[PDB]
Design a protein around this ligand. Structure first.
Ligand SMILES: *[C@@H]1O[C@H](CO)[C@@H](O[C@@H]2O[C@H](CO)[C@@H](O[C@@H]3O[C@H](CO)[C@@H](O)[C@H](O)[C@H]3NC(C)=O)[C@H](O)[C@H]2NC(C)=O)[C@H](O)[C@H]1NC(C)=O
Ligand SMILES: *[C@@H]1O[C@H](CO)[C@@H](O[C@@H]2O[C@H](CO)[C@@H](O[C@@H]3O[C@H](CO)[C@@H](O)[C@H](O)[C@H]3NC(C)=O)[C@H](O)[C@H]2NC(C)=O)[C@H](O)[C@H]1NC(C)=O
Ligand SMILES: *[C@@H]1O[C@H](CO)[C@@H](O[C@@H]2O[C@H](CO)[C@@H](O[C@@H]3O[C@H](CO)[C@@H](O)[C@H](O)[C@H]3NC(C)=O)[C@H](O)[C@H]2NC(C)=O)[C@H](O)[C@H]1NC(C)=O
Ligand SMILES: *[C@@H]1O[C@H](CO)[C@@H](O[C@@H]2O[C@H](CO)[C@@H](O)[C@H](O)[C@H]2NC(C)=O)[C@H](O)[C@H]1NC(C)=O
Ligand SMILES: *[C@@H]1O[C@H](CO)[C@@H](O[C@@H]2O[C@H](CO)[C@@H](O)[C@H](O)[C@H]2NC(C)=O)[C@H](O)[C@H]1NC(C)=O
Ligand SMILES: *[C@@H]1O[C@H](CO)[C@@H](O[C@@H]2O[C@H](CO)[C@@H](O)[C@H](O)[C@H]2NC(C)=O)[C@H](O)[C@H]1NC(C)=O
Ligand SMILES: *[C@@H]1O[C@H](CO)[C@@H](O[C@@H]2O[C@H](CO)[C@@H](O)[C@H](O)[C@H]2NC(C)=O)[C@H](O)[C@H]1NC(C)=O
Ligand SMILES: *[C@@H]1O[C@H](CO)[C@@H](O[C@@H]2O[C@H](CO)[C@@H](O)[C@H](O)[C@H]2NC(C)=O)[C@H](O)[C@H]1NC(C)=O
Ligand SMILES: *[C@@H]1O[C@H](CO)[C@@H](O[C@@H]2O[C@H](CO)[C@@H](O)[C@H](O)[C@H]2NC(C)=O)[C@H](O)[C@H]1NC(C)=O
Ligand code: NAG
Ligand code: NAG
Ligand code: ZN
Length: 902
């Protein structure tokens, strides 16, 4: 029998009740440059089953407790066994307290410890973050427990189902502010031992999970709002960011978002206050700590002066996402990490609903389709994918837990939940959701608990009828990987399903309990009119007159792509859809106008339609004004550009795109009143951004003229940038492309003095658009200079240069020649060789380039590839696939573009 301290899952013999935790970060290093924090904790737990051992999590903590590593006491008049010994078991991250007798069921005990750890700059547990304010380097203390790092800050039963209340105290410099999940109990008091420090106590948390705890010590300031219900809302950030008003947009949307969710969930916001904090360089992006949500600065802050509309969209959606968790995930918590997909998938869906409430004119809900659905379908259409569900017994180690946080969990999770809400109807979904939250508040669940409550809602009504139980249907979408392609023969109305793979040659080896058959909800529109809903059952082939058409009619499936599948038709129906889009596109919902493009290109890749059919689906775009269908084409054609932009195909391709985008460019020229006023709503602003990008990058003279005019105007008056933030990336790039060292040196100067990261990012990227070899080479020479290009921006900059058709060989030579820099950037800065390799070899599509890459690999004699080890193998296999693709498609594609480029 294995010893319990050698198992990754905690015993169930002891359950926590409540903790007292006091933490004291030392923001001044110890002269050796080591930063530490000290702590003291008492955990009160109940004995469920007799046991003579206490096993609790502890990671990277040294104990200074008097005696053994802990002191153990009985609660009330309970007696306690004597401690035999305490030991740390590093592998399973445990503190183990061996007793001389057994704890008794029903009795409560209190275990006290004193400890200290490194306050490392490692974004894990209680950690430090360094940043600059003027000439002064600032250091703050903050937390990231997410998943399994609470145990890195204090000893605890660190599993999400083992909830408890927490009493947090922070001891900190008296001129800094201390924040935690809950409000402070009152004013801070001087630390008696040293009044230079103060003590801030926080109100008891509700019953909650360790991974959601947070505490922060900083010089940050806030903007505030009190909601009508008395809930205090604050946005926290660097004093200078606050002064500049960069926290205002976040403050603006937070109240409405919280209001939306309280109603959506039929459950009051469960906390007295809401803090959200913008942290510089928070690489985790954002973390839903209950009552104290952390964000990277560029995700929470917004500068109206320099930020584009896409920045606003990022802010409102990221906030909606994290605030969604304040109920779903935090109030009701999934019992184990194998069900992470339900938590993150749910939030990834409802972020659009919450954001839509804050910005109801933006049509934000549409963005899940390009943003999550088609994004995740790219990886879920591979033999190497995996089901949403994972058996709980297979997820044990911190590494295995971390593997749960991927594209499948977030984006496919969002897609299937959205599909579920749609086929149940939102009203029914919300009823089951409310029932679920009410039943399990302050407790833990599995995904089966949600299905059960949704089923209760279904069973309580008569309108919505399903072909099977909620669980049976959802099992098809969660227990097996991938998704079907739905193929329709409109001559007969025959309809079929099969597991969709982008590679028609790939072998699926992962077995499915369902033989890769799904139960599929299928909406349809015929001649622009909605039809009755249909369910495809667990059969490969079926027939229905809903999908049978006349010679002059057309049918289109999966309205607004609510269903997690792609659709193919017979060529006659395709041609009819094309005809409709050519004559009156308004008859087909905008999302489905995009779908036709997204799906057909994927179908071409899989050899289910000819590549010419996919290209034919872009023909209507000359009359398309809306964002998504254009985006679908640009996303689908980026690979074509990547493969052909150095070949004879490129001329006709650009000419075709110029032809398609010119009418849209002209449209916005008038609408925007000579480019003086942006379109009103988000989607139209996005359409303008893409139109200008497409026009300029494909050499439309009218766009080139606009870019030159604006950049010249800016150069004549640097302090007054005349270029609207929305268009900066294109205008900067195209103008630098047209100009020489005058434009380049001007932009370089602007970059070196840039205050905001987003503006700096745009400048770095645009500088790579120069068509002068000597400028691109001189630029490459700067990428490895920390004084000129930040280390964290180095590979990004090289990749931008590589993206330039002229910069391609320059960057590839630069990477090869300077590869002897791995022993300089791996132990002192990750650098990420994987991203560099992928970006520079992205274009490779010939046997000659394959030989060059194989020749580059021949430096195998030590030096390795570091974190990019075997990422080179991905480039080798990708090149082989590109070679095969170009050979198969070159002639057909060239002729199509010539044929349609006028
Ligand atoms: C977890 O932390 C809690 C907050 O500190 C502890 O509860 C507090 O205990 C204090 C004493 O340990 C009480 O303060 C005063 O202590 C003096 C001792 O000399 C007593 O005479 C006073 O009666 C007492 N003050 C009052 C007003 O009664 C705090 O009152 C008390 N705070 C509370 C109950 O909110 C917990 O004891 C601690 N848990 C464990 C297990 O140690
Ligand atoms: C938790 O306890 C650990 C073990 O006691 C500490 O790690 C050790 O720190 C020691 C002191 O910094 C290192 O020993 C040597 O100390 C002298 C004088 O300080 C230095 O000149 C030496 O450079 C140093 N040795 C080395 C190899 O650098 C130990 O090496 C080191 N042990 C390790 C890393 O296993 C932790 O510091 C302590 N942590 C906290 C937060 O208290
Ligand atoms: C957070 O919410 C605030 C309240 O809704 C917004 O405040 C609005 O800012 C707008 C832009 O600054 C103002 O619109 C116009 O601004 C121009 C230029 O300053 C003025 O000439 C106009 O008079 C003014 N009004 C118009 C066009 O009707 C709004 O006046 C102002 N609204 C209110 C109620 O104060 C913030 O913009 C918003 N913050 C962010 C970052 O979105
Ligand atoms: C954290 O603080 C809370 C609030 O003071 C403590 O809750 C009290 O616990 C004691 C003993 O268990 C009870 O007699 C009181 O009724 C509780 N008060 C409330 C408001 O619930 C809690 O015990 C503290 N946690 C720890 C570990 O001491
Ligand atoms: C809080 O107090 C500390 C300590 O006095 C301040 O830190 C100093 O800041 C000045 C800048 O004015 C630096 O020159 C010193 O090097 C800092 N000293 C140390 C020991 O770090 C800090 O500025 C104060 N912060 C606030 C917000 O009042
Ligand atoms: C949760 O939803 C319930 C049911 O919709 C709400 O209770 C209803 O409130 C309306 C508003 O006037 C009344 O007309 C109904 O009679 C109520 N129904 C029932 C069954 O009580 C409730 O207000 C919501 N609660 C929260 C916290 O959002
Ligand atoms: C995990 O969640 C379950 C509920 O899904 C908790 O079990 C419930 O506990 C409450 C409070 O004691 C009881 O009222 C219910 O009867 C229990 N429901 C069951 C067993 O289905 C369970 O306590 C939670 N686990 C932990 C460690 O707290
Ligand atoms: C549509 O499906 C039907 C049946 O579901 C197919 O018709 C059958 O074709 C087979 C061919 O071997 C015959 O043995 C059966 O007698 C036919 N059944 C009938 C007429 O009821 C038909 O081929 C399918 N059409 C397609 C795929 O276009
Ligand atoms: C498909 O999506 C479109 C939006 O892209 C839906 O149209 C919206 O419908 C709601 C509710 O009727 C209106 O409040 C909006 O004004 C509509 N927006 C636009 C831009 O038209 C449409 O309802 C969806 N179709 C189906 C069948 O669900
Ligand atoms: C898949 O299996 C086939 C035989 O069915 C084989 O020819 C082929 O090499 C395998 N792998 C791929 C990637 O096609
Ligand atoms: C095009 O279709 C739309 C959507 O039904 C309709 O409102 C409009 O009248 C049609 N326009 C023309 C010119 O046929
Ligand atoms: Zn999330």
């Amino acid at each position: 029998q294995s010893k319990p301290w050698n198992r990754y899952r905690l015993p169930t013999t002891l359950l926590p009740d409540s903790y007292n935790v006091t933490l004291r970060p030392y923001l001044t290093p110890n002269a050796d440059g080591l930063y530490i924090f000290k702590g003291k904790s008492i955990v009160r737990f109940l004995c469920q089953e007799p046991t003579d051992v206490i096993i609790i999590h502890s990671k990277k903590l040294n104990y200074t407790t008097q005696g053994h590593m802990v002191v153990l006491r009985g609660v009330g008049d309970s007696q306690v066994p004597e401690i035999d010994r305490t030991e740390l078991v590093e592998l399973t991250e445990y503190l183990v307290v061996h007793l001389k007798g057994s704890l008794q069921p029903g009795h409560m005990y209190e275990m006290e410890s004193e400890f200290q750890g490194e306050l490392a700059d490692d974004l894990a547990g209680f950690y430090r973050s360094e940043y600059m304010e003027g000439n002064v380097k600032k250091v703050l203390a903050t937390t990231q427990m997410q998943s399994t790092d609470a145990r890195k800050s204090f000893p605890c039963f660190d599993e999400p189902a083992m909830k408890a209340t927490f009493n947090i105290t922070l001891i900190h410099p008296n001129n800094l502010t201390a924040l935690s999940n809950m409000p402070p109990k009152g004013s801070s008091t001087p630390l008696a031992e040293d009044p230079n420090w103060s003590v801030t106590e926080f109100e008891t948390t509700p019953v909650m999970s360790t991974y959601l705890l947070a505490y922060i010590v900083s010089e940050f300031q806030s903007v505030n709002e009190t909601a009508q219900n008395g809930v205090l809302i604050r946005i926290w950030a660097r004093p200078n960011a606050i002064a500049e008003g960069h926290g205002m947009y976040a403050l603006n949307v937070t109240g409405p978002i919280l209001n939306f969710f309280a109603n959506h969930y039929n459950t009051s916001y469960p906390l007295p206050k809401s803090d959200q904090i913008a942290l510089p360089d928070f690489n985790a992006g954002a973390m839903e700590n209950w009552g104290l949500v952390t964000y990277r600065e560029n995700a929470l802050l917004f500068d109206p002066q320099s930020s584009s509309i896409s920045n606003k969209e990022r802010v409102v959606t990221v906030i909606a996402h994290e605030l969604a968790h304040q109920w779903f995930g935090n109030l009701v918590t999934l019992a184990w990490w194998n069900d992470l997909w339900l938590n993150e998938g749910f939030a990834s869906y409802v972020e659009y609903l919450g954001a839509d409430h804050a910005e109801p004119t933006w049509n934000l809900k549409d963005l899940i389709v390009p943003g999550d659905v088609y994004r995740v379908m790219a990886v879920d259409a591979l033999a190497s994918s995996h089901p949403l569900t994972t058996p709980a017994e297979e997820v044990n180690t911190p590494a295995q837990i971390s593997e749960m946080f991927d594209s499948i969990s977030y984006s496919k999770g969002a897609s299937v939940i959205r599909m579920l809400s749609n086929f149940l109807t939102e009203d029914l979904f919300k009823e089951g959701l409310a029932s679920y939250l009410h039943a399990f508040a302050y407790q833990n669940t599995t995904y089966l608990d949600l299905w059960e409550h949704l089923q209760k809602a279904v069973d309580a009504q008569t309108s919505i009828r399903l072909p099977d139980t909620v669980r049976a249907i959802m099992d098809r979408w969660t227990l097996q990987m991938g998704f079907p392609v739905i193929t329709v023969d409109t001559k007969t109305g025959n309809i079929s399903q099969k597991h969709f793979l982008l590679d028609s040659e790939s072998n699926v080896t992962r077995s499915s309990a369902f033989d890769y058959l799904w139960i599929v909800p299928i909406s349809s529109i015929k001649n622009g009119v909605m039809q009755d809903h249909y369910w495809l059952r667990d059969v490969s082939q079926a027939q229905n007159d809903l999908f049978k058409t006349a010679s002059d009619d057309w049918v289109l499936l999966n309205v607004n792509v609510t269903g997690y599948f792609q659709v193919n038709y017979d060529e006659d129906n395709w041609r009819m859809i094309q005809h409709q889009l050519q004559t009156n596109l308004s008859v087909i919902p905008v999302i489905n106008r995009a779908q036709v493009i997204y799906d057909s290109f994927n179908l071409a890749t899989a050899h289910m339609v000819p590549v010419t059919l996919a290209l034919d689906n872009t023909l209507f775009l000359n009359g398309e004004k809306e964002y998504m269908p254009w985006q679908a084409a640009l996303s689908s054609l980026s690979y074509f550009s990547l493969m052909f932009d150095r070949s004879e195909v490129y001329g006709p391709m650009k000419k075709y795109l110029r032809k398609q985008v010119e009418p849209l460019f002209q449209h916005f020229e008038t609408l925007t009143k000579n480019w003086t006023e942006r379109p009103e709503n988000l989607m139209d602003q996005y359409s303008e951004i893409n139109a200008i990008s497409t026009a300029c990058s494909n050499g439309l003279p009218q766009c080139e003229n606009l870019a030159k005019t604006l950049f010249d105007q800016w150069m004549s008056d640097p302090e007054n940038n005349p270029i609207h933030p929305n268009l900066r990336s294109t205008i900067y790039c195209n103008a630098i492309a047209q100009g020489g060292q005058d434009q380049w040196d001007f932009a370089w100067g602007q970059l070196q003095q840039a205050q905001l990261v987003n503006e700096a990012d745009k400048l770095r990227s645009a500088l790579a658009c120069s068509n002068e070899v000597w400028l691109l080479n001189r630029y490459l020479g700067y990428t490895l200079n920390p004084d000129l290009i930040r280390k964290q921006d180095a590979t990004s900059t090289i990749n931008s240069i590589a993206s330039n058709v002229i910069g391609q060989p320059l960057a590839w030579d630069f990477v090869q020649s300077n590869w002897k820099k791995l022993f300089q950037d791996y132990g002192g800065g990750s650098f990420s060789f994987s991203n560099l390799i992928q970006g520079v070899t992205r274009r490779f599509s010939s046997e000659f380039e394959l030989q060059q890459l194989e020749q580059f690999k021949k430096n195998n004699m030590d030096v390795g590839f570091g974190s990019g080890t075997r990422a080179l193998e991905q480039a080798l296999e990708k090149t082989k696939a590109n070679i095969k693709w170009v050979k198969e498609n070159k002639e057909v594609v060239l002729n199509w573009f010539i044929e349609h480029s006028s």
